[PDB]
Design a protein around this nucleic acid. Structure first.
Lengths: 387, 57, 133
RNA sequence: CUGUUGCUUAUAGACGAUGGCAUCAGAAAUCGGUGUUGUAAGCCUCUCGGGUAUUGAAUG
RNA sequence: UGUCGGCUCUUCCUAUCCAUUUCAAGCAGAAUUGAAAAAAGGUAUGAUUGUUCACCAUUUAAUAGGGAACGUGAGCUGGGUUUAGACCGUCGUGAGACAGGUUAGUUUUACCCUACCGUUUCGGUAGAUUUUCAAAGUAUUUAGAUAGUAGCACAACUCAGUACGAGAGGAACCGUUGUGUCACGCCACUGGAUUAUUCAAUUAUUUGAUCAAAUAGUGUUGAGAAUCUAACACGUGUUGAAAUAAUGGCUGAAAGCCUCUCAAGCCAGAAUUUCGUCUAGAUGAAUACUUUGUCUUUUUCUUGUUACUUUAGUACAAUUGAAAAU
RNA sequence: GUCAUCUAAUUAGUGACGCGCAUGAAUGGAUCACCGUGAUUCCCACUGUCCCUAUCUGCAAUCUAGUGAAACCACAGUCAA
RNA sequence: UAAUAACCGCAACAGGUCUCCAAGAAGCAAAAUCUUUAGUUAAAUAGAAUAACGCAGGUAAGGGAAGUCGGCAACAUAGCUCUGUAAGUUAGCAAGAAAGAGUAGCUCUGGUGAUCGAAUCAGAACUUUAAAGGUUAGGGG
RNA sequence: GAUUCACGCAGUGUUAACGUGCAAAUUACUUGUCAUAUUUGAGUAUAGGGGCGAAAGACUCAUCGAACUAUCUAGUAGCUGG
C-alpha cells in the first residue's frame, strides 16, 4: 500500500556513509580549474577558527529595502599566521588520475614540519631530513635536484607547493605543524616551477592568496557529537506519548518484502566529526596590515579583533585573520582549509563592496556591555577593590 | 539607546524592545531588567541601576 | 493589494489562534483558520506573523460578523521577532484588522500601535494607523 | 620504529578508535582580565560591597 | 504465518495532479482543452465517522492514482471486529440466535544468525634495477576504480494597463528583490532548559541567641553564567561546460519534383544525461628516516614490524618482442 | 431519515416530525429532584497532547573486578530472477 | 521470633497474617514534613565513564486540543474569613453553586472570666520582595 | 443506612512499571472508600447432581459449566505419531 500522505525524506543520501574522519585537518577534494593565461598564484591557505562575533555593515547594493543604518550579520574569525613553504611536488596526468612524479624540498626544515613524520617525538632520534640537509650542497645531490626540476618541467601538468603553519604563533597547545599542498594556477609548467622554486623557505601571508571582498570555499571537519539517535541524526518525527518501549525512534524500518533493512532508513549511530565543504563564503575583512584591528571608519576607537576577556576556549588573536561572513564547520581551534572559489559567484551580492560600520568586541560570556576594557573602567569608575 | 529600567547604555544589536498598547515602547539591556520592569519594581530602590546611583552622590 | 516584499518575521500565530480585532467594526476577536500564501507541510499548522493575511472566523462580536469567515491582516503579535537592523521587539497583544482581498480596510480606525511590517505591505492600514512602531 | 603507560588529556569519545603533549613536560594554587548575583559580616555610611567564577572560559 | 484502520518510515510503478521542454485547437489576449518527452523534485490543514471510503470548510504551483504478505502489532495504538458481564428490538415453548444496536473488556519475549547503522582488530596485491637506482618497514603528503548525490518552488518590482482585443479585459522573455521548504552546518546576536543545589529572598524543623548552616531525596521562588540547543537565532546549496529526449529545423537522395533522414551527414532544443563541484572509498603514487643489494622456508625475540644472528644449498655481464593509417 | 440549532465546516450532540423492518403499559409505560471511581455532547480555564522539539536530575544501559542463569537450537546463515 | 530474615507463599520472596503501650514542633486534624527515647546505616556486589534508547521525576519562547477513537497523560483549582449564590425541586436540597474581596512582618488598643489565668475574636499605625501554598490542599458550568 | 479527612482497605485510570517479574496477579502514581447492609480474630455449622451464592455459573485449599484422591483401567479410539 502507498503511504497515505507524502513528505520529503529525512536527511540527505548525498552524505552516506555517515562516518567520522580520522585527521582533524580536511584535505580539499579539488582545486579551481587551471587557466594558462595568467600569472602564477596560490589557490589556498590554512587557518584556525578563533570564534564568532557580529558586525554592522553598510549596504551598498542598489534597489534593496534593507535599512540605511546597517544590517546585523554574524562573522567568523579565522586566524591565519603566515605559512612557511617547505617544498613542492609535481603531478602528472596518467590514465589512473594525477600521479606525483617527484617532490623537491628546501634545505632548512623546521622542527614543526619534522614532527609530522613520527608518532612519538620525545622518544624519537629527531633526525628527519637530516641526510637531506647534510648533503644538500654536495655536487651529486645538486645534480639530482636539478634533474628533479627538469623532470617536472617536462612530464608534469600540476604543481603544488608544500606549506606548513608556524604553531608558535597561535595559542594552540599543539607543536606539530599542519601541512597543506597549495596548487599553483598560472602560466606554463616552466614558469610554475620557477614560481615554486622562488617560494622555497619563504613565508606566504594570507593577503597574497586572497583579495578583498572575495567569496571563497572553506573545508573543515564539523563539531563531533558521538553516538546519536534518529531524531538528531536525521530529524524524524517523535512518536506519541502512548508509545511502548520509547518515543525517539523510527517506527517502521522497512516493508516485509524487500526482505532486508534498506540503506535509506534512518538508524542511530555516529554524528559529528564529518568533513564538509561550503562554497561562496564572502570575506568581510582582510585582516592584514592596517586592517589587523577591529576599528572601522565610523567607529574609530582603537581595538583589536579579540573580544573582551579573550575568545572563549581559544585565547587572543595577534596575527593576520579572515573575517568570514556567517558560519563555518567546526568548533574553535579547528583547522580550516581555505580555497579559492571553484565556481566564482556572479550574483550582485557576491560583487557587493563590504563597508563595516561596527565590529562587536564585547565579552562573549554573559550579557556584556562594554567594547573595551578601558571604557568599562571609565564607566564603572574606581572600584573599592582598586580605588 | 538607554535601558528603560537600569538606565544603562544598550550596546548595538543587543537587548529587546517592548511595545505597549498605550503607544509607548521601551528597550531593555537584558532579560534581568525586563522582568523587573514587568513587576513594577522601582529602579530607585534597586542598587545596581544607574537611576539609583544618580539620586545619591 | 499587498505591495512589495516582506522580510523574515517569525510567525508566532498558529491555526486556531485567537487575536483581537483592532478595527471598530463590531468584531471583538478572530480565530485564525488559514494563512494566505502558506505552503503546506505534513502535520504543520498554518503560521501567521506581522503583516500577514489570514482567514479568520469571528466567534465574538456583532451578529453581522459572528459565525462568519473574514479576512484580516495581523498588525501586531506578542511573539518576539528581530528586524534586519538588529532590533528585537514584540508587542503586548496579538491584534488584527479586517481587510478584503483588494486590500482596503472594512473599518475606519485602528486602536493601538501598528507594526511597520504591516504598514508597508498594506498602504490602507498605514493611513488609518495612529502610530507605526 | 611502533604499541602499552602518564597528562584522573583534549578540538574526540559507549568500549576501541581519533587528536595533542610527554622534563624547555605536565599539574597546582595565587594574581590580573572576564562574567553572574545584588550591596556581606562587626560596628542610612563604610559598600559598584561580599560571594562565585571552568567545572568543557582567557593571561601571567 | 497475530486477523481492520490510523500514527511512523523507506522504497518502487506511471495509466502525470504541479513545476521543465514541445505539438494541436472550434488557440486574438487571458483562462482552458487534446497529446508527446520526462518519475530527478513536490503533492497540505481541519469538522463528523473506528472507519478504507464519503461529504463539507479552507489553503496551495498541485493539494494525482497505486504497489511492496490488501508494506509496516518481540514498531505503537486498540477506536472497529472477535471469548467470558449486562441492556434493548425481533425470532424461539425453552435453553438460546441475530453480516442488529449499546456499554465494560490482560496486546508477552530479542541477549541468537543475518540485513541495516555506526565502531575496532589482524592480514595484505609482481615484476624496475642509470647507487642521482631498485625493494622492504615506519610516517606524512596525496590519489581516486567504484557507490551515493541536492536543491527545488512561490511571490514582489520592472516589463505594462504594454502586446492582443471593437470593448470588456489582459500577458511573456531578460534584469532585480525577497519568502517557504529540503540539505549541510553553527553559537556571534535573540529565546529555552539549568544540580556551576552560582547569588539573593523566603515557609517548616533543629542547631541556647547572633553568625553560619543543614534537613523537606532538587523545599520553593527571583535573577542566573557555562554547556547544549531553536520548528524560536543565523550562514551556504543563484554553479559552470558539452551531448541529448519529445519536437522544431539545415543540406539531401531514394522517387529528375518533393521530403527534418522507416537514408548517409548536421543544428537548435528538458525539472534530462555526462563532465565540473560535494561525501565515502579499493588497488595505488611521491617524499622523510631505518635498512638491504641472488634467493627462501622452518624455528625463534618483541606489544608488533623491519634490519639483524647461525648452519647449509643455490646463480654468476654480454645476441631477449615495435611502423602508422586505411 | 426530514427540518431547526450547535461549528468556518457536524455519519457525533440537542429540540421537533412519525404507517414505528421490529416502541408500548408490574416483559411494567411516562416522569426524572438528589446521588454515581456509570455512558454521551458542548463551553470556560489550563496546559508539550500538538505545531516541533530542546533540555536537567536519579537509576540503569557502556566498560571493568568478583559472581553468573534461561528461552530457543535438523544443518546453518549475503542477494536478484 | 512474632516478621522488609525465625510464620504461610519451593527462598533472607517489595505479597499475606489478630492485638497491647505511644514524646516535641505545626496544624482543625493520629494528615504531609522535621526532630527526641529506642532501633538501625545492613538489608538480591561495587568502581570508572557520563553515548544512544529507556524507567522515575521536572521545566519551556509564541500558540492553546489544531494531537487523538476519546483532553488519555499532564497542567490547572485548592486552607481560612467576609460578601454573594441561579434554573430546577420529592420543598428536604441544588450549595463549597457560580462570582467577587481579604490574608505577611513589626508596634499597639479593645471584647470575651474568677476571688491570677484561657487562647480566641475585632480594630489601628508603620514597613516590606504585597503575603494560604515549603508540605497539605475541590477545576467549574 | 447525611458530607468529608486520617489509620486501614480496595482496585477507576495510566490500558504506567514488570511481564524467563519482588510477585503462578505484585509495584508506583491517580482514584474510590474508610462503623451499623461497617471491618476483623478465634470457635463452630453446611460436602460433591452436594454445599454456599446481595446471582458473576461466582466460590468450595494456585483445581469448578460439577473438587481432590484411589480403584474399575494398560477404559475405547474407523484418528495422529513411531
Amino acid at each position: 500500500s502507498h503511504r497515505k500522505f507524502e513528505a520529503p525524506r529525512h536527511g540527505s543520501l548525498a552524505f552516506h556513509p555517515r562516518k567520522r574522519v580520522h585527521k582533524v585537518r580536511a584535505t580539499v577534494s579539488a582545486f579551481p580549474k587551471d587557466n594558462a593565461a595568467e600569472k602564477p598564484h596560490l589557490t589556498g591557505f590554512l587557518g584556525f577558527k578563533a570564534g564568532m562575533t557580529h558586525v554592522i555593515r553598510e549596504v551598498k547594493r542598489t534597489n534593496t529595502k534593507l535599512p540605511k543604518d546597517g544590517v546585523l550579520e554574524p562573522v567568523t574569525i579565522i586566524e591565519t599566521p603566515p605559512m612557511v613553504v617547505a617544498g613542492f611536488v609535481g603531478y602528472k596526468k596518467t590514465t589512473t588520475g594525477l600521479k606525483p612524479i617527484t617532490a623537491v624540498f628546501a634545505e632548512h626544515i623546521a622542527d614543526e614540519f619534522k614532527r609530522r613524520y613520527t608518532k612519538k617525538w620525545y622518544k624519537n632520534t629527531k633526525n628527519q631530513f637530516a641526510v637531506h640537509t647534510e648533503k644538500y650542497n654536495d655536487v651529486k645531490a645538486k645534480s639530482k635536484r636539478e634533474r628533479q626540476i627538469r623532470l617536472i618541467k617536462n612530464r608534469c601538468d600540476v604543481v603544488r607547493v608544500i606549506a606548513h603553519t608556524q604553531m608558535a604563533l597561535v595559542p594552540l597547545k599543539q607543536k606539530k605543524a599542519e601541512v597543506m599542498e597549495i596548487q599553483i594556477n598560472g602560466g606554463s609548467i616552466a614558469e610554475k616551477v620557477d614560481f615554486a622554486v622562488s617560494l622555497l623557505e619563504k613565508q606566504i601571508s594570507v593577503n597574497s592568496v586572497f583579495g578583498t571582498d572575495e567569496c571563497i570555499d572553506v573545508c573543515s571537519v564539523t563539531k563531533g557529537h558521538g553516538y546519536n539517535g534518529v531524531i538528531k541524526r536525521f530529524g524524524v518525527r517523535h512518536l506519541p506519548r502512548k508509545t511502548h518501549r520509547g518515543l525517539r525512534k523510527v517506527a517502521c524500518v522497512g516493508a516485509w518484502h524487500p526482505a532486508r533493512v534498506s540503506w535509506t532508513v534512518a538508524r542511530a549511530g555516529q554524528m559529528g566529526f564529518f568533513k564538509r565543504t561550503e562554497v561562496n563564503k564572502k570575506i568581510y575583512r582582510l585582516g592584514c596590515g592596517d586592517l589587523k584591528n577591529a576599528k572601522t571608519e565610523f567607529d574609530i576607537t582603537e581595538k583589536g579583533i579579540t573580544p573582551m576577556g579573550g575568545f572563549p576556549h581559544y585565547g587572543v588573536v595577534k596575527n593576520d585573520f579572515l573575517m568570514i561572513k556567517g558560519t563555518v564547520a567546526g568548533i574553535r581551534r579547528r583547522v580550516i582549509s581555505l580555497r579559492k572559489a571553484c565556481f566564482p559567484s556572479t550574483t550582485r551580492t557576491a560583487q557587493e563592496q563590504i563597508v563595516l560600520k561596527f565590529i562587536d568586541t564585547s565579552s562573549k560570556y554573559g550579557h556584556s556591555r562594554f567594547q573595551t576594557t578601558t571604557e568599562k573602567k571609565a564607566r564603572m569608575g574606581p572600584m573599592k577593590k582598586d580605588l | 539607546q538607554v535601558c528603560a529600567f537600569s538606565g544603562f547604555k544598550i550596546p548595538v544589536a543587543k537587548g529587546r524592545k517592548y511595545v505597549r498598547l498605550d503607544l509607548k515602547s521601551f528597550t531593555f539591556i537584558n532579560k534581568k531588567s525586563l522582568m523587573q520592569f514587568l513587576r513594577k519594581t522601582n529602579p530607585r530602590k534597586v542598587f545596581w541601576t544607574a537611576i539609583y546611583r544618580q539620586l545619591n552622590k | 493589494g499587498r505591495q512589495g516584499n516582506k522580510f523574515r518575521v517569525t510567525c508566532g500565530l498558529n491555526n486556531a489562534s485567537t487575536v483581537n480585532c483592532a478595527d471598530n467594526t463590531g468584531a471583538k476577536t478572530l480565530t485564525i483558520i488559514s494563512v494566505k500564501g502558506f505552503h503546506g507541510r505534513l502535520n504543520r499548522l498554518p503560521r501567521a506573523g506581522c503583516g500577514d493575511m489570514v482567514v479568520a472566523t469571528c466567534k465574538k462580536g456583532k451578529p453581522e460578523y459572528r459565525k462568519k469567515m473574514h479576512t484580516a491582516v495581523i498588525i501586531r503579535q506578542r511573539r518576539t521577532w528581530r528586524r534586519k537592523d538588529g532590533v528585537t521587539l514584540y508587542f503586548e497583544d496579538n491584534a488584527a484588522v479586517i481587510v478584503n482581498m483588494k486590500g482596503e480596510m472594512k473599518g475606519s480606525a485602528i486602536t493601538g500601535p501598528v507594526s511597520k511590517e504591516s504598514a508597508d505591505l498594506w498602504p490602507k492600514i498605514s493611513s488609518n494607523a495612529p502610530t507605526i512602531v
